[PDB]
């Protein structure tokens, strides 16, 4: 069969509005079980640096008791039917999810309107929350890979809300109280800013009757008048490095800006991700991997591991790669990773246009397999673009590019460029930012 | 569409299975039961190198070719092992899948096991051991196997120290052709018809030794080790023998570990609902993880506790897991808490098979041990057909058996087995 | 912690 | 692929000589009279060059 | 028949260990050399786990499970 | 076929490789494909390559040769670089036929 009507019969995503303008959308598959979640965009970059941990300790804080749920309540309610409850927050979103049967619907939903509207704080609870959250941040501190994205995240967007972590620094949560996350909670959980998300055997009228009936309790209306605008963050190219001798390896992370979740473009540069790819040590291709700096890794023997990444925010973003490497090869790896981006500027051919093409296939079909990542697909389209993109638009919005395209969106976003520089480690072969920014230009043209 | 798996026995023990998802991507499964626990003292770790040695030469198909082929039409392959079955998967697009799944077939078909290609495939095997070591729940888990049976199943599923560096192509050879036997295959796919199941079927598959090796029973054996390595955390994995696949008291087990904790449900939670995590939190004062551990095997199986704790506080962690259990053991509980361990039961399982990954595997897991496709239905009202009676009387069967421990961390405080 | 760092202000080097 | 810059048997010379040669970073430009003086020598040989070849 | 070295014929340089900080006159039997040892490869820093909070999940239930891949990266299962 | 075949002696005579104790595939020029064949030799095989080659080299040291009796007689001249470099012919031109697709 065409892949196209194959793409067609996946069922499309309902959804529908209430009266506060709370969002409700419900995905409907031949799965026994469901995962239902709520998607806020309220993340740090909401945030006004006087409560810099104010997401993270609060979700933190959002299951350890309701109002009419105290303690023990409703964690014995959600795991009588064996129901998985995790949340995350992001730097632009925060999720709550749920999964479960399809038998438990109207509690998954009573519990999941319990949760984020009613939600009761103790002062036990907020210092025992507080010690956690710094143990947390203690054992978080020892993995590199998060401090060398949140390195990244601080010299990238200086002086702007997009730099301070999720987490927040140490101060800010000492001197977090109950009053800050009272009034944070506030202004920040209301029903136009919120999407009620369903993935799985779910009736879409049930659960709209069910949301109608329990959800219709928001208090929406503007108590002070203070609308939070997103102010448009401003990329900086600049470069930090924390030299520290006595770890083993070196992470090093290079990004430039990247177009933002509106512009089509980045959809092309997944494209130019899937030209470079990933490698790791423990890969079973060896040494005919098809990427050519996967290639040059495998045969100079020089990373650890290497990754592209393109995180995407609100008018803004990141795209570019992350290696993890020995010191005695850092400076060659860099020289080799500008080369593969500069082929990505003149070098690009059909051939590996076509192989990042179906790359790109791959990965946005096989990803949105399971409720919870078609549910948090679902939740982070209604936040992020204002509707569900279905999967055969992505075809066609793939199928569009070819070399020609993909080459000057490359030349137009990577060549001759400031990039931001991230590292840590034994970095002292590292280079500057001159010979950086130097190699992010070709003579020849 | 959801309608059936359709299901084909052939006549040399050839099981096909095979789903018309008409799914987006199509996923090509071949499970087959030549597993770590087929080897002996002679050849140990070729399971290992065989996993790694999947993406080697084939006769049919270069290594490149592989590769470069898999690679450039968007395709994963990815083996699978435990202890009991290998698992060969390759997931594509529906229309290229076909000649993806002749590279699949060429990889168990025909290796050419070159000797250049396994010299410098050791070590690979050496970094993929260490990355798999640099957790400790792995040497925790295998130390323990390797205390609790005689043979045929204390065999680890990565390389010993002493075997890398002197496996030869000859031993791979010798498993593949003793150990890949036609009546030892189960071939499953999602997103493909059966007819080119069959025709795949019978024109890669249809020349075998039929059988194979038999195996050694894995004989219990019992006993503790414990290594000193000086980890801030202390772990012990203390288990007895339990029941093996397809009896009636397997579920009894898995009823009974749902019952004193298997795993979290909320993230950052407290775990009130499992007793062995209620009763160390009663005791201690200082972070900690206690679960039960379940493990069922084609002739034998293993279930115990599992702690995590604090280098001196490690002797009331474990104390106080064994009287929980004990004080289980002669019916000290509830069938509301009995009611809601089958209700985590039943909404794990459910959840294991939302994926088409997990889907695929426990297809092929049913195919190759029983070799009929039982429905999810089925399954389900055979947990619920399991009484309170049932796990008093598993309790007892650990408590009243020989134990098997394996230890890591500051043992200084930590006790025996005599000691419990 | 490494959430306690951050940039210092470059207000009077940048344009 | 190798780097052409660290593998030429002709320019790793140049290079560990000219390029990538660690220097420390608060020199002054008084270090910079050294290589004035090299330079210095070179016209003086190419101006006695231009002192005897037509004369 | 105290000094166990004395009791034990055989295996008398076996439970007890001889050193010597300086080199006496007559060479020993038996001088040995180590030759080249292997070299373990080198890692990442393990994730610490200092909070009951990350502990949990952290215990094993369920067999092993290894994973490999061709461009996946080795998975391991508990 | 007699044409031949005492050509090829008389050529295999004349060429003065059997005069040092070699074999034909001793007197490769070692490119990069033959010594990727090289280095998927069995170690015996190789150890004999290597002692031959030696041998070669500090006999031409002195202008001397071997004795009559034991120069490389042309029915025991084995041709075992042969499939290896066959083989490594084989892969190099797929992978370039794969670059030029
Ligand atoms: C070019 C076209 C083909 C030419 C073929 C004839 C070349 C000359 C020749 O035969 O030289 C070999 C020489 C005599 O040859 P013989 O083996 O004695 O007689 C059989 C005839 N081929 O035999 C010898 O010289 C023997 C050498 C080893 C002693």
Same mark, same amino acid.
């Given at each position: 069969a065409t892949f196209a009507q194959a793409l067609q019969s996946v069922p499309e995503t309902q959804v529908s509005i209430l009266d506060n303008g709370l969002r409700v959308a419900s995905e409907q598959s031949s799965h026994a079980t469901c995962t239902v979640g709520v998607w806020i965009d309220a993340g740090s970059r909401y945030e006004?640096?006087?409560?810099?941990?104010?997401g993270y300790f609060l979700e933190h804080l959002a299951?350890?008791?309701?109002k009419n749920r105290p303690g023990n309540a409703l964690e014995k309610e959600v795991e009588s039917i064996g129901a998985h409850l995790n949340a995350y927050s992001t730097r632009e979103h925060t999720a709550y999810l749920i999964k479960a049967l399809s038998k438990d619907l109207p509690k998954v939903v009573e519990l999941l309107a319990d949760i984020v509207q009613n939600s009761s704080l103790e002062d036990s609870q907020i210092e025992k929350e507080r010690d956690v959250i710094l143990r947390e941040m203690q054992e978080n501190d020892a993995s590199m890979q998060n401090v060398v994205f949140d390195y990244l995240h601080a010299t990238a967007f200086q002086?702007?809300?997009?730099?301070?972590?999720?987490?927040?620094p140490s101060e800010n949560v000492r001197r977090l109280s109950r009053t800050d996350l009272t009034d944070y909670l506030n202004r920040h959980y209301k029903a136009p800013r919120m999407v009620l998300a369903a993935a799985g055997g779910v009736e879409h009228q049930q659960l709209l009757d069910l949301a109608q009936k329990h959800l219709?309790? !928001?208090?929406?209306?503007?108590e002070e008048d203070a609308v939070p605008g997103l102010t448009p963050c401003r990329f900086t190219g600049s470069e930090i490095r924390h030299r520290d001798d006595a770890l083993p390896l070196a992470h090093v992370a290079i990004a430039v800006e990247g177009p933002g979740?509106?512009?089509?473009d980045n959809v092309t540069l997944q494209v130019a991700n899937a030209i470079i790819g990933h490698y790791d040590c423990?890969?079973?291709?060896? !040494?005919?991997?098809?990427?050519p700096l996967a290639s040059v890794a495998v045969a100079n023997k020089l990373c650890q591991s290497f990754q592209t990444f393109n995180i995407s925010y609100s008018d803004t973003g990141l795209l570019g790669a992350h290696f993890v490497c020995d010191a005695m090869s850092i400076d060659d790896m860099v020289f080799f990773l500008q080369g593969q981006w500069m082929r990505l500027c003149t070098?690009?051919?059909?051939s590996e246009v076509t192989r990042g093409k179906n790359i790109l296939r791959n990965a946005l079909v096989s990803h949105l397999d399971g409720t919870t990542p078609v549910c948090e697909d679902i939740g982070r389209s209604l936040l992020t673009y204002g509707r569900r993109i279905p999967l055969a638009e992505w075809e066609s919005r793939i199928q569009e590019v070819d070399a020609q395209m993909l080459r000057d969106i490359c030349s137009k976003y990577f060549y001759d460029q400031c990039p931001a520089v991230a590292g840590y480690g034994p970095?002292?072969?590292?280079?500057?930012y001159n010979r950086i920014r130097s190699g992010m230009f070709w003579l020849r043209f | 569409q959801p309608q059936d798996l359709e299901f084909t026995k052939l006549p040399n023990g050839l099981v096909i299975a095979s789903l018309?998802?008409?799914?987006?991507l199509s996923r090509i499964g071949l499970f087959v039961?030549?597993?770590?626990?087929?080897?002996?003292?002679?050849?140990?770790?070729t399971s290992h190198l065989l996993r790694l040695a999947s993406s080697l030469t084939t006769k049919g198909a270069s290594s490149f070719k592989i590769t470069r082929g898999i690679e450039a039409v968007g395709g994963k392959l990815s083996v699978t092992a435990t202890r009991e079955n290998m698992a060969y998967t390759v997931e594509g697009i529906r229309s290229d899948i076909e000649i993806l799944m002749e590279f699949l077939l060429n990889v168990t078909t025909?290796?050419?096991?070159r000797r250049w290609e396994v010299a410098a495939l050791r070590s690979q095997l050496k970094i993929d051991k260490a990355v798999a070591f640099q957790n400790s729940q792995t040497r925790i888990i295998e130390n323990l196997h390797d205390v609790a049976?005689?043979?045929?199943?204390?065999?680890?599923?990565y390389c010993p120290d002493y075997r890398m560096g002197k496996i030869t192509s000859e031993e791979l050879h010798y498993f593949v052709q003793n150990?890949?036997?036609?009546?030892?295959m189960a071939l499953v796919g999602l997103g493909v018809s059966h007819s080119v199941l069959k025709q795949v079927a019978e024109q890669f598959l249809n020349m075998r030794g039929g059988l194979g090796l038999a195996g050694a029973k894995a004989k219990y054996r019992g006993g503790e080790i414990r290594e000193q390595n000086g980890d801030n955390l202390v772990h012990a994995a203390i288990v007895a023998e339990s029941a093996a696949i397809g009896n009636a008291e397997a579920n009894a087990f898995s009823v009974l570990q749902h019952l004193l904790?298997?795993?979290?449900?909320?993230?950052?939670?407290?775990?009130?609902?499992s007793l062995l995590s209620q009763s160390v939190a009663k005791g201690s004062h200082q972070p900690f993880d206690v679960s039960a551990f379940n493990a069922s095997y084609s002739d034998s199986g293993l279930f115990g506790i599992y702690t995590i704790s604090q280098a001196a506080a490690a002797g009331e962690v474990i104390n106080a897991a064994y009287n929980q259990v004990k004080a289980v053991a002669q019916g000290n509980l509830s069938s509301a808490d009995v009611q809601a361990a089958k209700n985590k039961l039943k909404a794990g399982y459910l959840m294991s098979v939302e994926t088409s990954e997990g889907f695929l595997s426990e297809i092929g897991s049913q195919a190759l041990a029983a070799g009929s496709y039982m429905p999810p239905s089925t399954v389900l009202q055979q947990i619920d057909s399991v009484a309170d009676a049932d796990v008093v009387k598993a309790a007892k069967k650990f408590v009243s058996g020989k134990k098997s421990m394996a230890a890591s961390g500051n043992l200084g405080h930590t006790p025996f087995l005599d000691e419990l | 912690s490494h959430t306690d760092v951050k940039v210092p202000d470059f207000s009077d080097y940048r344009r | 692929m190798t780097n052409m810059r660290k593998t030429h048997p002709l320019f790793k010379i140049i290079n560990h000589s000219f390029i990538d040669l660690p220097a420390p970073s608060?020199?002054?430009?008084?270090?910079?009279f050294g290589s004035l003086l090299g330079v210095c020598l070179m016209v003086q040989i190419i101006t006695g060059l231009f002192l005897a070849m037509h004369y | 028949m105290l000094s166990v070295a004395a009791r034990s014929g055989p295996f008398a340089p076996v439970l007890s260990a001889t050193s010597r900080g300086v080199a006496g006159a007559l060479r020993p039997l038996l001088q040995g050399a180590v030759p080249a040892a292997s070299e373990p490869p080198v890692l990442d820093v393990k994730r610490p786990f200092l909070c009951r909070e990350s502990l949990s999940?952290?215990?094993?239930?369920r067999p092993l499970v290894a994973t490999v891949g061709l461009n996946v990266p080795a998975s391991v299962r508990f | 076929s007699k044409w031949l075949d005492g050509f090829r002696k008389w050529y295999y005579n004349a060429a003065g490789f059997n005069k040092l104790g070699?074999?034909?595939?001793?007197?490769?020029?070692?490119t990069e494909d033959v010594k990727e064949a090289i280095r998927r030799l069995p170690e015996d095989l190789y150890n004999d390559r290597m002692f031959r080659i030696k041998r070669a080299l500090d006999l031409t040291m002195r202008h001397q040769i071997l004795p009559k009796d034991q120069w490389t007689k042309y029915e025991e001249?084995?041709?075992?670089?042969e499939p290896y470099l066959k083989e490594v012919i084989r892969e190099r031109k797929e992978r370039e036929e794969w670059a030029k697709k």
């Open positions: 006004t640096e006087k409560n810099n941990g104010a299951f350890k008791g309701t002086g702007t809300p997009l730099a301070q972590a999720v987490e927040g219709s309790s !928001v208090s929406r209306v503007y979740w509106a512009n089509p423990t890969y079973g291709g060896g !040494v005919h991997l098809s990427s070098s690009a051919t059909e970095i002292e072969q590292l280079p500057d | 018309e998802n008409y799914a987006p039961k030549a597993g770590s626990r087929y080897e002996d003292s002679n050849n140990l770790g025909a290796p050419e096991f049976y005689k043979n045929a199943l204390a065999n680890p599923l150990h890949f036997t036609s009546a030892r904790g298997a795993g979290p449900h909320i993230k950052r939670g407290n775990n009130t609902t | - | 608060n020199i002054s430009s008084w270090w910079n | 999940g952290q215990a094993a239930a | 070699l074999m034909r595939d001793d007197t490769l020029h070692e001249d084995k041709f075992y670089l």
